[PDB]
């Protein structure tokens, strides 16, 4: 089912708030949660239902890293994940850069 | 009709060949344009059919403005065309800045 086809930023500042455009086959916006983890750590992309564009692009925020005071880049990765029943896409990965 | 509901930059390098990923409402992948125009000045966003996201989003690269060698920025419109009989979203200001 899910899919990221694309995202226009495969990578971000470890305090996060950065917004990236995400294209995605189709999802409903009330049921879609955009998922960065490393395995486990987990944080959640900050959008809400509206800023789903059509059922097939998600504009968001990233979230922070669980270590602001990297020195390194931090490898992870990045899911879409149904909310209800928590069927994932495939994983894209994502780097974690220090500030 | 035609709408560009977000852009995910109003700006870029005089020399083009940047991409962009553009949110738009309905459109046909083998009937749209991408317009960028100054008042009259024009260059279209480089993009193929495939890069038509299910008719709702398209990646894209700048064309390049008509003055590489600009020492300041230079404001443009960039809006959505269909091919077939010109229809055009309303436009989208976008800066073009110095290489």
Redesign the interface.
């Known amino acids: 089912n899910l899919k990221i086809?694309?995202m226009?930023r495969t990578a971000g500042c470890v305090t996060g708030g950065e917004?990236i455009?995400l294209?995605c086959?189709?999802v409903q916006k009330d049921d879609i949660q955009i998922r960065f983890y490393e395995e486990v750590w987990e944080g959640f992309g900050d959008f809400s239902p509206t800023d789903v564009?059509?059922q097939?692009?998600i504009?968001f925020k990233t979230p922070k890293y669980k270590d602001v005071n990297i020195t390194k880049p931090a490898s992870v990765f990045v899911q879409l994940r149904r909310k209800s029943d928590l069927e994932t896409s495939e994983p894209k990965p994502f780097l974690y850069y220090p500030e």
Chains 1, 2 share one sequence.
Do not use: G, T
């Open positions: 086809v694309r226009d917004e455009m294209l086959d189709k564009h059509r097939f692009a504009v």
